[PDB]
Design a protein around this ligand. Structure first.
Ligand code: CHL
Ligand code: CHL
Ligand code: CHL
Ligand code: CHL
Ligand code: CLA
Ligand code: CLA
Ligand code: CLA
Ligand SMILES: CC1=C[C@H](O)CC(C)(C)[C@H]1/C=C/C(C)=C/C=C/C(C)=C/C=C/C=C(C)/C=C/C=C(\CO)C(=O)CC1=C(C)C[C@@H](O)CC1(C)C
Ligand SMILES: CC1=C[C@H](O)CC(C)(C)[C@H]1/C=C/C(C)=C/C=C/C(C)=C/C=C/C=C(C)/C=C/C=C(\CO)C(=O)CC1=C(C)C[C@@H](O)CC1(C)C
Ligand SMILES: CC1=C[C@H](O)CC(C)(C)[C@H]1/C=C/C(C)=C/C=C/C(C)=C/C=C/C=C(C)/C=C/C=C(\CO)C(=O)CC1=C(C)C[C@@H](O)CC1(C)C
Ligand SMILES: CC1=C[C@H](O)CC(C)(C)[C@H]1/C=C/C(C)=C/C=C/C(C)=C/C=C/C=C(C)/C=C/C=C(\CO)C(=O)CC1=C(C)C[C@@H](O)CC1(C)C
Lengths: 218, 212, 221
């Protein structure tokens, strides 16, 4: 249903003729959606698949990282200095500092320069290991699905379940990317956090659509 | 022999040879040999780009006509619209009277943006699915030139005239795309409608221009 | 060698093995093996991108020099330009006296933006037509390294020195493109010239740095 000629395509019942010949339903999340022909070249196709999967995983991390602080502040009881994701970084420029979970005994960051440089070093090492191997492995996988050390629970030991989980991962990552773009556009237009916008919409949905701040494009 | 073949009209005139890529052999309409970024080297990517360009061209022609018509009708004709300006035309749905067609209170008289959007998405989704795969009005014989039900006047029954008309269509669509980019930039910069810009420029050209 | 072939220097150092595209074999200048997006997989698109990159590099080197020169001359010398800042230099044409070269009314002394625009479009149209086609300064020759009339000093005569000079040119051009992007971003965020930014930074490096409340409160204006 997710692989082969008889899979589920992007246009649904009207997919015949809209599926490129090079999208044969071999890789995860192949709905046949390529209208610009950007992935016609197999090498470019592989590079775009790697970029898409990295973006998907980063967005799945990001949606949770943007919703958890605001949810905890609003619905829970935590008292973060800046709950919304798009002003969280500005908390580093505060008298108290960047206190984790509002606790001054946790993290208590005071210098943005040290933060950015240690992050640069650590992420440089991590991304070098990701594309060329390192302490956690010699990059046996396609650089997208290493396994061995990044699959400690052994959930991908069966090829059928592996393919099913890859479909689930790519679909969840695409949904998270869509939601992250929604987060960006909501922050740009309304200037409010995703949790606040969601709570406002559940209150009077017919009056707080996106068709209120339609003026002033970006 | 002028818009097709090896001795075409090219995008640099006399300085074109040595800048026309080898994969642009002048087989398709509007082949001036302008591929400097190599974005259409792959024939499948080239076909996708051609489809995108033609759809954009037709949409831009429609948009140019539909952006010029209301403002021209208000300024010259006399018809009073809620917002004749093309980039202000969306906002009248949020007004008190609503979006009344041609200003007349008995035409359309739209009162809900949500209904408009949720009907347009359905109608255009069906139309776009029929374009890709066929439907009531055809079987999607050609992704760009289906013909038949979309050529009722029968003006494409001669291959020579068909090629000439395809060249005319693609050139007019490229001109309309350029004009729509101009409309967007004028709206961002000047903040006033294209008809107002044209009238002001015709009034005093030596001062009312882009360098103000 | 060091810049060409399999044993060249790559874009990730030790962690580059396995991230180098198979079509990047270290044949062309500046081949560090950085094509993660796979945009240059097609050889035709590859050489188009090489041409675009080299032209951008040369334009960016010229632009970096021409953006740093006037502001540096105004602050660190007695030059009196009307607007030494690079992103406010175009606005002098709308002033009372127009563009005055080095601030002297007697040099160029532009008054009409119309003559400037036509003359520039005509001259650059001929220049680019000659670049892509050939003309008074050469008919054949390479599209990126014509030489002959454009290499009067004869520096590019030894093939090894030619390759090394091409490496130097592409690296300097990439550095200048990075610097020009930095100029754009500083102009958008800080609103002050690159020389002013450099002076403010070397004054108080830890205080007047890029991590500022107002300088980061907006993304691209
Ligand atoms: C048969 C009907 C059917 C139709 C019409 C579609 C149509 C679509 N599917 Mg879909 N699907 C359909 C059945 C199915 N799909 C799927 C599974 C999927 C998936 C997994 C995905 C899609 C996606 C898409 C979209 C891809 C094209 C696009 O981005 O358009 C959008 C482009 C437009 C121009 C439409 C915009 C209309 C809008 C009203 C414009 C108005 C704009 C603003 C109001 C104002 C303008 C702003 C100004 C200021 C700049 C498109 C909406 C993809 C997607 O969601 O990407 C976004 C995607 O990933 N479909 C399945 C299960 C197999 C179906 C089963 O029947
Ligand atoms: C072994 C370690 C090593 C590492 C990790 C790198 C890594 C890099 N080299 Mg490099 N090199 C390394 C050794 C060497 N290099 C080179 C020669 C070169 C060259 C010639 C070039 C590179 C480039 C690069 C960069 C290309 C990828 C990129 O653009 O990241 C950046 C992408 C990111 C996602 C970084 C994000 C982290 C950053 C902290 C974000 C900042 C946070 C902001 C506050 C948030 C922004 C706010 C919002 C609005 C977005 C990358 C930083 C290229 C480059 O400089 O392009 C820019 C380039 O041209 N390298 C040599 C000589 C042979 C090395 C020798 O050992
Ligand atoms: C995932 C990518 C990433 C994204 C999308 C953002 C997004 C943002 N950061 Mg940011 N950051 C990101 C990585 C990082 N940031 C920071 C540290 C900061 C700081 C200190 C600040 C931002 C601010 C911002 C915002 C820019 C101002 C604005 O109005 O935007 C539209 C924007 C929401 C600013 C902000 O939140 O002001 C309201 C701000 O002061 N970021 C670090 C640590 C170096 C990052 C590390 O990768
Ligand atoms: C053809 C695509 C399309 C374009 C270009 C626009 C353009 C615009 N609409 Mg819009 N709309 C479009 C489709 C639709 N609109 C609406 C319903 C509305 C409403 C209710 C409103 C707008 C408004 C706007 C303006 C946003 C305010 C602004 O800052 O302008 C700057 C934007 C530009 C100069 C255009 C830049 C966009 C880019 C060039 C096009 C790329 C996107 C395309 C993909 C779709 C802008 C001129 C608002 C307005 O009129 O306020 C003055 C407003 O209230 N639109 C519907 C019905 C659902 C559409 C259906 O397809
Ligand atoms: C997972 C997808 C997803 C979900 C669940 C939501 C949910 C929501 N969005 Mg949203 N959005 C999304 C994607 C999504 N968005 C994307 C991709 C964009 C970029 C175009 C936006 C841009 C956007 C704006 C500009 C605004 C919202 C707003 C809202 C809230 C009110 C509903 C509304 O007006 O819808 C609007 C929905 C769209 C514009 C596109 C939805 C497309 C999926 C339909 C199927 C609601 C919580 C509004 C808000 O803040 O509430 C007060 C608001 O002003 N969204
Ligand atoms: C891509 C094509 C396109 C699009 C999207 C639009 C979109 C729009 N037109 Mg429009 N128009 C177009 C082509 C287009 N036009 C062309 C080609 C013409 C010339 C015949 C017109 C002539 C025209 C007039 C005379 C008016 C509009 C109006 C409108 C607006 C309300 C739509 C409505 O109620 O009519 C839907 C009605 C029917 C389908 C019947 C809307 C922004 C109205 C408006 O308020 O704009 C300011 C209006 O009075 N249009
Ligand atoms: C890409 C190359 C480039 C471009 C487009 C410009 C563009 C400009 N330069 Mg400039 N410049 C450049 C490279 C460049 N420069 C380099 C490499 C240097 C170092 C020698 C300078 C040194 C320089 C000075 C010293 C001055 C300018 C000035 C100017 C402005 C007036 C134009 C003029 O009178 O020139 C046409 C002049 C002749 C044909 C002679 C204009 C914005 C003037 C200005 O107003 O500064 C803001 C000015 O006083 N430039
Ligand atoms: C298919 C197809 C075929 C056609 O032929 C052509 C085509 C149509 C083009 C093509 C389609 C392609 C399409 C649709 C393109 C869309 C791509 C998109 C939208 C990608 C989105 C990426 C989203 C990301 C990575 C978000 C990460 C967020 C982070 C980072 O982790 C944080 O939140 C980090 C964070 C957190 C967690 C807490 C906060 O406080 C602070 C910050 C730093 C913000
Ligand atoms: C068929 C089917 C069968 C299967 O069995 C299950 C299935 C697969 C699920 C199912 C599939 C269903 C499918 C594919 C249907 C597709 C749905 C679509 C196309 C919905 C699109 C809706 C569009 C909307 C609301 C646009 C609103 C824009 C706003 C408001 O916010 C702006 O203000 C615009 C705006 C402005 C004006 C200023 C800018 O700055 C910011 C922005 C936001 C761009
Ligand atoms: C060739 C080439 C080779 C090189 O190697 C690389 C290269 C250089 C990159 C490459 C060159 C490519 C180039 C130049 C790209 C240029 C692209 C451009 C500018 C496309 C423009 C498209 C514009 C469009 C569709 C406008 C549609 C308008 C509508 C919608 O129909 C309405 O008005 C609808 C409307 C109306 C009618 C009434 C209003 O009230 C409300 C609204 C909704 C706005
Ligand atoms: C490698 C790679 C592999 C992956 O797989 C995919 C990938 C990541 C995408 C890809 C990477 C590619 C990357 C990084 C792209 C980056 C591109 C950039 C930043 C290019 C920058 C260009 C900068 C230029 C030309 C500046 C010219 C300035 C002028 C004009 O000369 C003036 O100053 C002129 C001037 C002067 C001199 C005085 C002023 O007063 C007035 C003005 C007119 C402004």
């Amino acid at each position: 249903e997710w692989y082969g000629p008889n899979r589920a395509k992007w246009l649904g019942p009207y997919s015949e003729g809209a599926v490129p010949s090079y999208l044969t339903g071999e890789f995860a999340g192949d709905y046949g959606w390529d209208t610009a022909g950007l992935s016609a070249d197999p090498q470019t196709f592989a590079s775009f698949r790697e970029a898409e999967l990295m973006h998907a995983r980063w967005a799945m991390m990001g949606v949770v990282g943007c919703l958890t602080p605001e949810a905890l502040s609003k619905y829970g009881g935590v008292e973060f200095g800046e709950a919304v994701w798009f002003k969280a970084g500005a908390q580093i420029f505060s008298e108290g500092g960047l206190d984790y979970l509002g606790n001054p005994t946790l993290v208590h960051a005071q210098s943005i320069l040290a933060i950015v440089w240690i992050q640069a070093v650590l992420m440089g090492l991590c991304e070098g290991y990701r594309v060329a191997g390192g302490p956690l492995g010699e990059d046996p996988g396609d650089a997208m699905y290493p396994g061995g050390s990044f699959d400690p629970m052994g959930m991908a030991d069966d090829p059928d379940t592996f393919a099913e989980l890859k479909i689930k991962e790519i679909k969840n990552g695409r949904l998270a990317m869509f939601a992250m773009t929604g987060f960006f556009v909501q922050a740009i237009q309304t200037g409010k956090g995703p949790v606040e916008c969601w709570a406002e919409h559940i209150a009077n949905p017919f009056t707080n659509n996106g068709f209120v701040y339609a003026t002033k494009f970006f | 022999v002028e818009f097709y073949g090896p001795d075409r009209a090219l995008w640099l005139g006399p300085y074109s040879e040595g800048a026309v890529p080898s994969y642009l052999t002048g087989e398709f309409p509007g082949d001036y040999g302008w591929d400097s970024a190599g974005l259409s080297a792959d024939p499948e990517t080239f076909a996708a780009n051609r489809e995108l360009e033609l759809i954009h061209a037709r949409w831009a022609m429609l948009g140019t006509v539909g952006c010029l018509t209301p403002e021209a009708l208000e300024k010259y004709g006399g018809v009073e619209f809620g917002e004749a300006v093309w980039f202000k035309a969306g906002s009248q749905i949020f007004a008190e009277g609503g979006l009344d067609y041609l200003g007349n209170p008995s035409l359309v008289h739209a009162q809900s943006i949500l209904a408009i959007c949720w009907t347009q998405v359905v109608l255009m989704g069906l139309a776009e699915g029929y374009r890709c795969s066929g439907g009531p009005l055809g079987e999607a014989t050609d992704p760009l030139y289906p013909g038949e039900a979309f050529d009722p006047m029968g003006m494409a029954d001669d291959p020579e005239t068909f090629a000439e008309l395809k060249t005319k269509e693609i050139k007019n669509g490229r001109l309309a795309m350029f004009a729509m980019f101009g409309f967007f930039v004028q709206s961002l910069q000047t903040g006033k409608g294209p008809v107002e810009c044209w009238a002001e420029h015709i009034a005093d050209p030596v001062a009312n221009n882009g360098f103000v | 060698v060091e810049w060409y072939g399999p044993g060249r220097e790559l874009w990730l150092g030790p962690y580059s093995s396995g991230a180098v595209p198979s079509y990047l074999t270290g044949e062309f200048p500046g081949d560090y093996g950085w094509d993660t997006a796979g945009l240059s997989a097609d050889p035709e698109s590859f050489r188009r991108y090489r041409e675009i990159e080299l032209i951008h590099a040369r334009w960016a080197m010229m632009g970096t020099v021409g953006c740093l020169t006037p502001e540096a001359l105004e602050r660190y010398t007695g030059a009196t330009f009307g607007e030494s800042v690079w992103f406010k230099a175009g606005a002098q044409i709308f002033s009372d006296d127009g563009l005055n070269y080095l601030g002297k009314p007697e040099l160029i002394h532009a008054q009409s933006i119309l003559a400037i625009v036509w003359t520039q479009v005509l001259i650059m149209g001929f220049a680019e037509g000659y670049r892509v086609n050939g003309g008074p300064a050469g008919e054949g020759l390479d599209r990126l390294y014509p030489g002959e009339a454009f290499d009067p000093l004869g520096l590019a005569d030894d093939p090894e020195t030619f390759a090394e000079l091409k490496i130097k040119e592409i690296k300097n051009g990439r550095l200048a493109m990075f610097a020009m992007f930095g100029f754009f971003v500083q102009a958008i965020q800080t609103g002050k010239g690159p020389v002013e930014c450099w002076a403010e930074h070397v004054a108080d490096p830890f205080g007047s740095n890029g991590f500022n409340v107002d300088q980061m409160s907006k993304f691209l204006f």
